[PDB]
Design a binder for this molecule. Structure first.
Ligand SMILES: CC(C)N(C)c1ncnc2c1cnn2C
Ligand SMILES: CC(C)N(C)c1ncnc2c1cnn2C
Ligand SMILES: [Cl-]
Ligand SMILES: [Mg+2]
Ligand SMILES: [Mg+2]
Ligand SMILES: [Mg+2]
Ligand SMILES: [Mg+2]
Lengths: 194, 194
């Protein structure tokens, strides 16, 4: 039933644009929406990746490796899956492994890769691949993980046991001002509900 | 260590605005970011998303999702039921209301997250994730009546919790839909649990 009639540009920055979207509703009435899009998406299957990094070590409970960063849109620190935009020509798996090493120091192994999933579909066209990666924490490569952050990237690594993820997140939120990402929270909640 | 210096309005629609954010990096170097915000925030958060666990005796437990045309995406998306919190609504109450409007199910609150971020690299948008049970054997939920607001056109898709990630992948394969990142992240963690 529904389709896009037109996309009018309102304002274009270096990274993000706003559009006036005109569409057909299922009654045959024409309507509008205000849409956010990134300016950086070329031939990539998605804007970005987020990495679910499962750190595995013998005689340790598995951990989910998270990162804490200052996020200017939010005006504060956020705890998220390691994540970044996919470079032109890069595969989602390659962007995931690259971002994970850059942000955390870990060299992971691909486990699975989602289709393009939407970040906030009521507002933006932004998509990511959610890529699950296992990190062999017994490998010497992963002993003293050294992050190699890019220009303007400032990251703290936080590894939390998978078996207690939601309580350990609540305990960090209780101790300082800091926002957990919706994807991390959704993942932690499902680990509880299962 | 990092903080916001100033925010310059670039462009303000009715629903969304685009700001140019100035901030201090950890080195004491001043930097800029392009930041999206909703204009509608009053609230604990902009919105709620509802994880609705449909429980019927002698049936698999289902997670209730919605499929809707999303103009920023130019297509159909599969999501948790969700909407903006009305000024002076609690998240709990917004959840049950949004669930009823979008699905017609009448639910009970199990738990409620703190405010979690949607896409903190781009926007300040936050939601409360609210886990709700639905006693699908109650007379009120027998023939549930979705009461949509203006400009909402919602198909309800109920999927078994125990096979959620495979069922979502099947839909995507056949139906050309985008699954929401929080739905996919929940579904993933249901598979990754112990
Ligand atoms: C359906 C009604 C209440 N309108 C048009 C909207 N509701 C929520 N977010 C919106 C719009 C339009 N643009 N954006 C970003
Ligand atoms: C060079 C990198 C770190 N910068 C500036 C950015 N990276 C990704 N998204 C961005 C920005 C700025 N605005 N927005 C929306
Ligand atoms: Cl539950
Ligand atoms: Mg990143
Ligand atoms: Mg990065
Ligand atoms: Mg909604
Ligand atoms: Mg609604």
């Amino acid at each position: 039933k529904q389709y896009i009639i037109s996309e009018e540009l309102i304002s274009e920055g270096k990274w993000v644009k706003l559009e006036k979207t005109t569409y057909m509703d299922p009654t045959g009435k024409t309507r509008t929406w205000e849409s956010v899009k990134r300016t950086t998406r070329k031939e990539q299957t998605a804007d970005g990746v987020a990495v679910i990094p499962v750190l595995q070590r013998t005689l340790h409970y598995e951990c989910i490796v998270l990162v804490k960063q200052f996020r200017p849109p939010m005006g504060g620190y956020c705890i998220e899956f390691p994540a970044g935009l996919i470079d032109d020509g890069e595969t989602p798996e390659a962007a995931a492994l690259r971002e994970l090493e850059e942000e955390t120091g870990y060299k992971g192994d691909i486990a699975e890769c989602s289709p393009a999933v939407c970040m906030d579909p009521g507002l933006s066209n932004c998509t990511i691949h959610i890529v699950t990666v296992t990190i062999n924490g017994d490998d010497a490569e992963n002993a003293r993980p050294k992050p190699k952050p890019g220009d303007g990237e400032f990251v703290e690594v936080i590894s939390l046991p998978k078996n207690d993820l939601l309580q350990r997140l609540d305990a960090l939120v209780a101790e300082e001002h800091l926002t957990v990402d919706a994807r991390v929270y959704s993942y932690a909640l499902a680990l509880k509900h299962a």
